[PDB]
Design a binder for this molecule. Structure first.
Ligand SMILES: Nc1ncnc2c1ncn2[C@@H]1O[C@H](COP(=O)(O)OP(=O)(O)O)[C@@H](O)[C@H]1O
Ligand SMILES: [Zn+2]
Lengths: 148, 64, 39, 781, 50, 252, 365, 224
């Protein structure tokens, strides 16, 4: 049951939709709720898609990741495992690895990920000490404007 | 003028080099040894020695 | 020797000194009156 | 800083080492038995053992080997101490005077090193040229004998294999040769080497390595006629001689591992073997013209669990047992019609590992009376102690006790007992739990090779017979036990904290508090309470039940519904194992944080960390002496006395007295065996030592300290071992000189020395006053 | 020292080179009294009046 | 027989003839040998040192202490003036030793190189003058010697003299220097000496100049400033601390 | 675990068994701070940490921004969860702060009344624990990459200093004589260590990629010459011949000074016997280092099997020393890790990285 | 045991591709692939090398490249090809002396000048004779590595094949790919040595993550 998952994430990502299609979003939600190794498979899909060079695609992948994060618990451990690389690819903290074009998509990704990090710190921050550390690290070492 | 400068922190001479991304009007200076990195805007007149001297003031100003 | 390595005369003499008569004859160094390691 | 006085109520009795030889005289057949700090000299008479001397080492006797150098009339004695005090001793009897002289002495401790897993092993070359010691991993300390040292100089020969299981010196070797079994990732192996003193290094062995049984755990050096050595595995037995490879697999040994051995014949054609189970076996080497032909194993019979045995003569074998009473037996040529050729000749009482103990004023006299959970698996028995000398009784259980408590209202003892079953499950022998007057099985709803079974045995405190045995659930361990009445109703209960043991988890996560009431000869299940962890300890606390779940100490209340209800919890604990009480103060013995003085606040109804010691000591007991003096015995055989200090600094307890008792204190208990000193707390130990600790006054402490200094200046130790060093507080990462304690034995030895020695000691009051004072100190025990 | 031997082989090389070729670009001329450099075997045979 | 720390035994009768200070010196010298470092005998002229060295060497060979069993092929660099004195003293005090002279006078009457080879293969004490070492440095420095005792080694104070560079070739760590005055003009002599016996201790030469030669020497001038005098005093104390173990300097 | 308690009470097994088994079981279950948090005082990354030897309470720490901070680790509060305060500090306003990143800081062994520190400003200041004033300095001609005082010497008090110059300095604290140098290396010396077993055996490693075990009493350079392939032939004293194929920026003697662990910029670690320098062919796989300066790591003590806590990128990688198993990886930092220390009393690890954080890993349950 | 593993891997060598001029070569990393216990693999390889069955040669293309060759394949191919192509030109005798004296004696990876000048009486002329034979190559001044004549062809093919295989894994989805899928796939023409050979090498050097899944062992690129 791996082909359909890859297909579905492919349509969700490659479409470049400004907003996720809710019906296939719900299909993904239900089908991922089916199994946990399949949840990891979806996570791997998202990580692979994030590296690909397009800001809109990365925005879609990050939005999916945020949905799963807020919805799933094991997904939280799984992503906060590599929170380092996740922040690197979304925030573009390393200048050596900037965010691809378009510029509008990159800025939207920046704003959305800042807000998502803030919300996660508010919600699960105590539950994942590494999240609190990452928030603080962003706030001071990188000086990310959370009020923007 | 010359381009490699003593790291202000690890005191290793000629260990800092600069990357002037003229596209974004931003230049980066990075200490290869201590991996310290300083970011700052540049204009079409700016030079590495101008960028470096922004770093030192940033170091001292924060060190106040 | 950059790809910035300060290459030494002894390295050079050892390298040259192994060259055979035929390759140096190809280079034009006539092997009998000019051997590249006597440089 | 605090003031205390310990003393030996009863010397240790278990044996950890015994060797037979000619030490007292060249002709004497001497049997030397090493009780923990007592080295008892006997002479093997035609019948029994004739005592000739007992002496006090300043050191736990770890190694003891008799050897006869070239030109030496009678065997010399070499003994090592756990603190690595080395000493060679010689028997010199000047008529009536028996003078154990110190030929050569010294200390051999390396400054830093990982003390080896299997403990110190000391072996001597058969030709008596050198002494080989294996103290630390990777090194092999070698002490030459030909180079006559009065100091025991040594040197180290690095050992490329780091995990050695056993090592022996091979016979029939022109140069000293060592065989050892070592463990590496590939499995267990055997190798040999050749020691070269001049080079101070090994050389290639007479024959190359070889792959052995997985559990090859012993090596037996065969004498010259056969040469080579014999490896004993858990399952098979083998013999190697470089080329000869004899292997056997007798199934009879598979049930229990062979732990000990002793050669019977001077030529070594006959060997004895004992297992943990106590079955005594015989190994017989068949020669062929000589070389080795065949290996044979035969069951001679069963004995006490033999930690160490030695054939004396004439079929007389001495069984030295650390777990049960030491035995003297006769090996019959003919079986005893039960497959057994062994018949018990003599038994020496051994208060086994005193796993738990309780004082009772039985008979309602003014004299205390101790009842101890002595013994072990098969030797499990109860001893009863009184002054009459110390009287000793016995009550065999044939199963290990774990805790004991007394219910005077019920006139019985709550004795946790446990047995082993091999298979559903089958009991190996008929024990006390299975032989009870009445029995029942727990049927709880909270939960739904060879295995252990736990039972609660209700014992008459008059006749010492099993009134009841309420067996527990399957895979349940009854850990702690207390007899008391809770809340406000008058019923005195037997409360049993338990745990759910399964092989798949290291830490039990499931346990239940069960309250029983023994009445009408029957144990009724009054109540229950599931908990999320084992209950390592419970104790009454002012009408309430203070129980110790894995890492949470909580106060339980006996509700009017006859049920447990938590009041409060405290969590800053690694593992709260040992608990004691006096007023609103508790003393929590952490597994490694060593104390936590928790005072219960009733006006709030919770706990407060009044203070804590931060030295990481691994506790084995705990007890409150006074309102502000706390005793604790760590696992490394030391006593430390913590006193409340005098800000947050007030939170730091202070270790005021430090002392190396040399034993493993299993239990403390307030009381006194008898009808100047304040308080009295008795402790049992692993080696059967029973001791008493008491307080003093300051001037008395100063005087006694001075007297001890004088005695040390005067009395000459066995191995020239300085007393202060012997009693110095010692740990793997620390070492401090003893303070705040007055060694009982040394002071009480003031009497048995001659008048010039007192006058020398009392060179600065008179000797008679000190004689009176030491008599008074002797009075308490 | 690595840097001292670097300098001393630099100096031996310098002396040989200025023995057969004194006028090198950037490098200093081997000096002599009266304020004048030396004359190498290449100046002996360079040009007019060589 | 006198018994030292580990295994060094000197015959008792030989020990008896020695004075207190000389036997103290023998103990110190064997301690040096234990550390495997060189040393200088600082005893003033005539306090008696050839006796000390002969006693130590005889005890070492006698002790059979552990390449070399006991004493290996040594060499004694001495000025020409005292060579036969050396031979006489060796014969008187320890006649077991084979002492063979490498000199034109000599006692060989054949190729010298044969003599050096034979002494090396015989564990003998070869004596020679500085001139042969300067000339035969190739031949001397190939035989895996054991000791390189320098009698009146203060000749070596010139760091770059041919004799100095010649004698600084022996690879053994046991280097002995005999001179009651191991500094005669200035600190550079001290430097070269401790270069020969313990190459690392004082730093490289220029470092040594900067660190001690200037603050010490310049502070002794009549016009020295008091602060500079205290500086020189400090540095002198430090240097004496540094070099203390390796000079044994008893006065008359 | 109850079986161990039974065996210990009955005298079946020595208490040693339980102690070391439990210590190992705690080290395996190590994970990020449930119940600690280190106060934040450093503006830059933390280059070094050094828990005191005796009583293991106080913990120096040397920041990349020149400040030293002295911590307290004991939970003086009454709560289950607390923080490690800072006791004092050699701040930036102290008259004797280092002008640059502090590269090494070490307690004085045998007594907490002192601590030594080194920095890239070519100075090795010798502080007082109590008065907090630099009671000495050794000024050097090149930057000081690392130092180390002997951990066992009751006699000598030398202080090896490995600088960017090829000379190993041996300063003394007893009357200060910084002249001594060990001749033989060829480039920068990125790490030095004293043997814990033998007083005088110093092992230094240099960017020219070989480690050399000196004896500092001798006058014959080095003793042993570490060679990857441990072939038959022998060599003189140089930094050459490749203990590693790249810069060697790490050293650690195992707990009792027998072997010798060396990480190097060729992404390898090697366990060498330290009696004969014999590469014992344990391997550990591919351990990532690319630090251009010294790399600090540690080994456990009082555990049944011996571990090593080697930084690995931004993660601490735990291996078993003698077997090479990769037990686990600790993933809690965001930049490269630079120093880790081990608290042998309670089997706890503290880790410092460039991200200006000092995390605590404590055993769970 | 490593001995088996090297045997099977040596079978995978396509001898025909190098017209039997080159003895078959196995990379130590591939030995790690079949023997996961890296330490035991190294110990047993050292055991074999001491016994003299195999030689280890520094291939140079990576500092961690040690090629493993059976000693008899080495002797056979070198004697045959070198002496045939060099019948008459002088270094044939010198190479014969080398194969007769050094290789049976010391299996060491590098050769230093002192050893050949003294222990083996080789001259500078003979050392140059060897160097032109391809049998030695310069490590340093007066230092040389053992070598196989003609190894450059194999090195070039191996390098291009490795990078091609890594690229193929990269271009698969996730940067992931199942091992069976890779092996069954049609090999690129650049990959001249066969895919199993290169796959073992990649797995052994930890260049590719081996993930045991329900469908088999998946290849994933570790995150760089
Ligand atoms: N214990 C002694 N017994 C006999 N002669 C001695 C003794 N001590 C010193 N001498 C003699 O004193 C003289 C000076 O000693 P020597 O070592 O030759 O000169 P210096 O003391 O200047 O080195 C020698 O002749 C020596 O034999
Ligand atoms: Zn820097």
């Amino acid at each position: 049951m791996d082909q359909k998952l890859s297909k579905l994430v492919e349509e969700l990502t490659t479409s470049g939709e400004p907003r996720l299609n809710p019906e296939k979003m719900k299909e993904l939600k239900k089908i991922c709720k089916s199994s946990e190794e399949q949840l990891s498979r979806a996570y791997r899909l998202l990580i692979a898609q994030l590296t690909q060079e397009h800001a809109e695609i990365r925005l879609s992948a990050f939005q999916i990741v945020e949905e799963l994060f807020v919805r799933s618990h094991q997904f939280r451990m799984l992503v906060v495992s590599n929170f380092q690389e996740f922040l690197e690819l979304t925030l573009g903290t390393d200048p050596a690895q900037p965010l691809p074009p378009p510029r509008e998509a990159a800025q939207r990704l920046r704003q959305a990920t800042t807000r998502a990090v803030e919300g996660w710190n508010e919600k699960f921050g105590e539950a994942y000490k590494k999240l609190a550390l990452g928030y603080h690290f962003l706030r001071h070492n990188k000086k990310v404007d959370f009020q923007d | 003028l010359e381009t490699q400068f003593t790291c202000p922190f690890c005191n290793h001479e000629k260990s800092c080099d600069v990357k002037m991304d003229r596209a974004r009007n931003t230049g980066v200076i990075s200490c290869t040894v201590c991996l310290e990195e300083f970011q700052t805007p540049i204009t079409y007149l700016s030079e590495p020695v101008d960028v470096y001297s922004d770093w030192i003031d940033a170091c001292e100003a924060a060190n106040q | 020797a950059e790809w910035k390595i300060l290459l030494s005369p002894e390295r050079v003499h050892e390298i040259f000194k192994r060259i055979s008569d035929e390759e140096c004859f190809v280079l034009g160094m006539e092997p009998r009156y000019a051997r590249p390691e006597w440089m | 800083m605090s003031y205390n006085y310990v003393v030996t109520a009863q010397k240790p009795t278990a044996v950890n080492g015994c060797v037979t030889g000619h030490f007292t005289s060249a002709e004497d057949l001497n049997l030397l038995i090493a009780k923990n700090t007592r080295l008892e000299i006997y002479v093997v008479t035609a019948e029994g053992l004739r005592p000739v001397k007992e002496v006090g080492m300043y050191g736990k006797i770890a190694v003891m080997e008799l050897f006869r150098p070239k030109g030496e009339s009678k065997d010399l004695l070499f003994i090592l101490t756990a603190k690595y005090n080395a000493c060679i001793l010689e028997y010199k009897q000047s008529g009536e005077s028996i003078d154990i002289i110190t030929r050569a002495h010294g200390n051999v401790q390396d400054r830093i090193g990982r003390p080896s897993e299997t403990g110190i092993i000391g072996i001597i070359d058969p030709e008596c040229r050198m002494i080989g010691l294996r103290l630390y991993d990777g090194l092999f300390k070698v002490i030459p004998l030909d180079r006559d040292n009065k100091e025991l100089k040594a040197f180290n020969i690095r050992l490329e294999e780091l995990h050695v299981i056993d090592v022996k010196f091979l016979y029939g070797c022109q140069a000293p040769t060592i065989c050892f079994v070592y463990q590496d990732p590939q499995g267990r192996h055997v190798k040999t080497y050749e020691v070269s003193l001049r080079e101070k290094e090994f050389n290639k062995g007479p024959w190359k390595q070889e792959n052995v049984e997985a559990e090859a755990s012993m090596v037996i050096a065969v004498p010259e006629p056969f040469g080579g050595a014999i490896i004993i595995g858990q399952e098979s037995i083998t013999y190697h001689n470089g080329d000869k490879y004899l292997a056997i697999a007798p199934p009879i040994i598979k049930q229990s591992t062979i732990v000990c051995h002793n050669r019977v014949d001077p030529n070594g054609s006959r060997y004895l073997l004992g297992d943990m189970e106590g079955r005594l076996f015989m190994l017989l080497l068949e020669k062929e013209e000589v070389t080795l032909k065949d290996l044979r194993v035969e069951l001679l019979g069963e004995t006490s669990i033999a930690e160490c045995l030695t054939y004396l003569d004439n079929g007389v074998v001495f069984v030295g047992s650390r777990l049960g009473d030491s035995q003297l037996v006769k090996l019959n040529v003919d079986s005893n019609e039960q497959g057994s050729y062994v018949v018990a000749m003599e038994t020496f009482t051994n208060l086994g590992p005193i796993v738990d103990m309780c004082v009772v004023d039985l008979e309602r006299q003014g004299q205390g009376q101790l009842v101890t959970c002595s013994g072990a698996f098969k030797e499990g028995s109860l001893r009863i102690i009184r002054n009459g000398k110390l009287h000793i009784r016995t009550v065999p259980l044939y199963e290990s006790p774990r805790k004991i408590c007394y219910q005077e209202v019920s006139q019985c003892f709550g004795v946790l007992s446990s047995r082993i079953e091999v298979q559903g499950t089958t009991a190996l022998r008929p024990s006390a739990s299975t032989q009870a007057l009445s029995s029942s099985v727990s049927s709880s709803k909270l939960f739904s090779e060879e295995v252990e079974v736990h039972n609660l045995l209700i014992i008459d405190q008059h006749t010492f017979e099993v009134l009841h045995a309420h067996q527990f659930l399957q895979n349940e361990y009854a850990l702690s036990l207390v007899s008391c009445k809770l809340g406000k109703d008058p019923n005195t209960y037997f409360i049993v904290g338990t745990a759910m043991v399964y092989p798949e988890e290291a830490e039990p996560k499931q346990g239940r508090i069960v309250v029983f009431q023994y009445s009408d000869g029957k144990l009724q299940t009054v109540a229950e309470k599931e908990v999320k962890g084992a209950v390592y300890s419970m104790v009454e606390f002012n009408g309430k039940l203070l129980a110790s779940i894995n890492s949470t100490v909580r106060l339980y209340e006996w509700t009017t519904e006859k049920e447990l209800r938590t009041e409060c919890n405290h969590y800053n604990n690694i593992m709260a194992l040992y608990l004691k009480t006096k007023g609103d103060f508790i003393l929590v013995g952490d597994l490694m944080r060593s104390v936590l003085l928790l005072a219960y606040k009733p006006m709030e109804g919770n706990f407060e960390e009044i203070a804590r010691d931060f030295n990481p000591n691994w506790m084995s007991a705990v007890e409150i002496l006074d309102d502000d003096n706390f005793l604790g015995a760590e696992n490394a055989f030391n006593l430390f006395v913590c006193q409340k200090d005098s800000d947050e600094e007030r939170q730091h307890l202070q270790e005021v007295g430090l002392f190396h008792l040399g034993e493993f204190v299993n239990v403390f208990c307030h009381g006194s065996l008898v009808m100047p000193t304040q308080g009295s707390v008795l402790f049992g130990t692993v080696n059967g030592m029973i001791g008493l600790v008491t307080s003093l006054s300051e001037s008395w402490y100063n005087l006694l300290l001075d007297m001890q200094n004088r005695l040390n200046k005067v009395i000459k130790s066995v191995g020239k071992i300085e007393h202060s060093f012997w009693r110095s507080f010692h740990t793997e990462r620390k070492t401090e000189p003893a303070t705040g304690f007055i060694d009982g034995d040394l002071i009480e030895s003031f009497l048995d020395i001659s008048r010039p020695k007192m006058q020398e000691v009392v060179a600065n009051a008179t000797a008679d006053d000190l004689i009176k004072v030491v008599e008074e100190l002797t009075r308490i025990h | 020292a690595a840097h001292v031997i670097a300098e001393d082989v630099k100096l031996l090389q310098f002396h040989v080179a200025t023995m057969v070729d004194n006028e090198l670009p950037g490098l200093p001329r081997a000096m002599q009294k009266s304020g004048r450099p030396l004359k190498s075997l290449k100046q002996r045979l360079k040009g007019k009046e060589g | 027989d006198a018994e030292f720390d580990e295994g060094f035994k000197v015959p008792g009768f030989l020990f008896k003839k020695l004075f207190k200070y000389q036997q103290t010196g023998v103990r110190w010298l064997w301690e040096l040998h234990c550390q495997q470092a060189g040393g200088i005998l600082g005893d003033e002229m005539g306090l008696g040192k050839t006796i000390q060295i002969i006693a130590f060497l005889a005890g070492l060979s006698y002790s059979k202490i552990r390449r070399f069993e006991g004493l290996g092929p040594t060499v004694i660099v001495c000025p020409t003036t005292v060579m036969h004195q050396w031979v006489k003293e060796f014969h008187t005090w320890w006649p077991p030793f084979r002492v063979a002279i490498l000199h034109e006078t000599g006692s060989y009457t054949h190729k010298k190189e044969k003599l050096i080879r034979d002494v090396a293969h015989c564990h003998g004490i070869l004596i020679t003058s500085y001139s042969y070492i300067r000339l035969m440095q190739d031949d001397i420095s190939r035989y895996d010697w054991h000791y390189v005792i320098l009698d009146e080694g203060h000749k070596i104070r010139n760091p770059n003299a041919a004799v100095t560079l010649a004698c600084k070739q022996f690879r053994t760590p046991h280097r002995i220097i005999l001179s009651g005055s191991p500094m005669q003009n200035n600190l550079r002599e001290l430097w070269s000496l401790f270069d020969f016996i313990f190459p690392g201790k004082l730093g490289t030469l220029p470092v040594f100049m900067e660190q001690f030669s200037v603050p010490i020497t310049m502070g002794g001038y009549s016009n020295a400033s008091p602060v500079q005098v205290k500086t020189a005093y400090k540095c002198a104390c430090v240097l004496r601390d540094t070099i203390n173990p390796y000079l044994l300097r008893r006065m008359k | 675990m109850l079986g161990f308690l039974s065996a210990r009470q009955t005298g079946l097994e020595d208490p040693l068994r339980l102690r070391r088994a439990e210590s190992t079981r705690r080290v395996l279950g190590l994970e990020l701070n449930k119940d600690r948090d280190v106060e934040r005082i450093h503006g830059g990354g933390i280059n070094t940490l050094d828990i005191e030897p005796v009583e293991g309470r106080y913990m120096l720490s040397g920041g990349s921004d020149g400040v030293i901070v002295l911590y307290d680790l004991e939970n003086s509060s009454r709560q289950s969860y607390y923080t490690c305060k800072a006791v004092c500090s050699i701040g930036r306003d102290h008259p004797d702060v280092h002008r640059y990143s502090v590269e090494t800081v070490q307690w004085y062994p045998h007594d907490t009344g002192m601590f030594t520190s080194s920095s890239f400003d070519k100075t090795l200041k010798v502080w007082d624990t109590n008065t907090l004033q630099t009671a000495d300095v050794f000024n050097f001609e090149e930057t000081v990459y690392s130092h180390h005082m002997s951990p066992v010497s009751t006699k000598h008090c030398l202080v090896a200093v490995g600088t960017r110059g090829p000379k190993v300095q041996l300063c003394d604290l007893k009357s200060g004589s910084c002249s001594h140098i060990l001749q033989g290396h060829r480039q920068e010396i990125l790490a030095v260590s004293w043997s814990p077993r033998y007083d005088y055996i110093l092992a230094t490693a240099s960017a020219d990629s070989r480690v050399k075990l000196w004896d500092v009493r001798r006058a014959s350079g080095c003793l042993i010459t570490l060679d990857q392939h441990n072939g038959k032939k022998s060599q003189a004293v140089e930094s050459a011949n490749t203990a590693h194929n790249g810069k060697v920026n790490g050293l650690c003697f195992t707990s009792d000074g027998l072997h010798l662990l060396t990480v190097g910029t060729d992404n390898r670690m090697r366990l060498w016997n330290s009696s004969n320098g014999e590469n014992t062919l344990v391997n550990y796989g591919k351990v990532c280092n690319n630090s251009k300066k010294g790399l600090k790591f540690t080994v456990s003590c009082g555990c049944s099997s011996e571990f090593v806590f080697v930084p690995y990128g931004s993660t601490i990688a735990v291996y078993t020393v003698y077997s090479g198993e990769q037990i686990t990886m600790l993933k809690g930092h965001y930049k490269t890790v630079d120093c880790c220390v081990f608290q042998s009393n309670f089997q706890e690890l503290y880790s410092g990285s460039r991200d200006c954080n000092i995390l605590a890993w404590v055993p769970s349950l | 045991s490593a001995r088996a593993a090297v045997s099977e891997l040596m079978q995978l060598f396509p001898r025909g591709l190098f017209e039997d001029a080159l003895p078959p070569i196995v990379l130590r990393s591939q030995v790690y692939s079949l023997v996961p216990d890296r330490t035991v693999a190294d110990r047993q390889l050292k055991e074999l090398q001491e016994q003299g069955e195999i030689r280890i040669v520094q291939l140079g293309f990576d500092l961690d490249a040690h090629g493993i060759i059976f000693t008899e394949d080495y002797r056979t191919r070198v004697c045959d090809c070198v002496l045939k192509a060099c019948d008459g030109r002088p270094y044939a005798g010198a190479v014969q002396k080398f194969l007769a004296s050094v290789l049976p004696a010391c299996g060491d990876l590098s050769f230093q000048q002192d050893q050949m000048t003294q222990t083996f009486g080789f001259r500078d002329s003979e050392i140059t004779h060897l160097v032109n034979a391809g049998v030695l190559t310069v490590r340093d001044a007066g230092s040389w590595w053992l070598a196989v004549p003609g190894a450059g062809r194999f090195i070039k093919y191996f390098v291009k094949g490795r990078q091609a295989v890594l690229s193929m894994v990269r271009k698969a989805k996730y940067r992931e790919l199942l091992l069976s899928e890779l092996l069954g796939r049609r090999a690129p023409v650049v990959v001249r040595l066969g895919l199993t050979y290169h796959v073992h090498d990649l797995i052994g050097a930890q260049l590719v993550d081996c993930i045991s899944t329900t469908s088999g062992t998946l290849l994933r690129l570790p995150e760089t």
